[PDB]
Amino acid sequence: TIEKRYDFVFLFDVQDGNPNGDPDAGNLPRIDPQTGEGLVTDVCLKRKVRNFIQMTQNDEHHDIFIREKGILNNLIDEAHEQENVKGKEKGEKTEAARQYMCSRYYDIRTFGAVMTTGKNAGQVRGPVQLTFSRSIDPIMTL
């Protein structure tokens, strides 16, 4: 684990596309309606981190909490099919499954993952957290 509380500003651009143009309440890039400032959802940037790590790390201890063929209950059950098959005493079983999701998956280590879904792998609060990235000036949507 780390020992310093890094806090950062990420300034990223978008030139000729949707930064996070999937506000399915519509489709125009996610804007702040009262300012017109764009709102790249922090989950969009987290999915970008997921995709980068998937392209690059592509290893155990750096798994991604993956795309479409990533039905989450299946991945979470893969935590309950290991050292904590059943011998972890549900209160500790969830903790151990959560620990395995951390160690194995780079995303649950970096960000979190609501995993209390199938054989509940607990909640990870995501040491690294991004916030809704908003544009400094209001974005015009071409």
Partner DNA sequence: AGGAGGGCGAGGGCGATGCCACCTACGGCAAGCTGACCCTGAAGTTCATCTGC
CA 88 to chain centre: 26
Q: How far is the CB of 24 from DNA (least distance, A)?
A: 4
Residue 9 corresponds to which tokens in the numbers above? 């500003």
116 binds DNA (CB under 7 A): yes
Closest to 100 in 3D by CA, of 128, 85, 55: 85
Which window, 4-12, 78-86, 91-99, 114-122, contacts DNA (CB under 7 A)? 114-122
58, 74, 82, 117: which one binds DNA (CB under 7 A): 117
Contact status: 41 vs DNA (CB under 7 A): no
Nearest to DNA of 44, 113 (CB atom): 113
Closest to DNA by CB, 25 or 136: 25
- Closest by CA to 22, choosing from 10, 34, 36, 40, is 40
Among 3, 7, 24, 137, binds DNA (CB under 7 A): 24
Binding DNA (rule: CB under 7 A), the pick from 57, 74, 123, 141 is 123
